[PDB]
């Protein structure tokens, strides 16, 4: 029968990221934009994230992104 497919970012979650301006204040940090840009070019996304769960700047911006997409 039917199954879940929720491992893709939705149009409503995309809208809530781009229209939230408090998120943009966190992304304007030059240390965040460099690590976000290097992340997508990496071949091991899970291995890259496991280096940033330990970082107090990258954890705080991730926590705000992860709140914004859960607050649908």
């Amino acid at each position: 029968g039917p199954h879940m497919d929720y491992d893709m970012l939705t149009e409503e979650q995309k809208k809530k990221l781009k229209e939230d301006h408090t998120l943009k204040i966190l992304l304007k940090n030059n240390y965040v934009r460099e690590v976000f840009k290097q992340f997508t070019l990496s071949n091991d996304k899970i291995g890259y994230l496991s280096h940033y769960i330990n970082d107090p700047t990258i954890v705080q911006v991730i926590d705000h992104i992860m709140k914004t997409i859960d607050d649908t």
């Binding site: 970012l9 990221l17 992304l27 994230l49 991730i62 997409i69």
Partner: peptide, 25 residues
């Protein structure tokens, strides 16, 4: 668990970077 949380996180990184949220130019 971390592995279910990361799948939503990484598709947010890949959207934010493609639309260049931090770059006004």
């Amino acid at each position: 668990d971390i592995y279910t949380y990361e799948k939503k996180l990484i598709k947010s990184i890949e959207y934010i970077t493609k639309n260049k949220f931090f770059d006004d130019s």
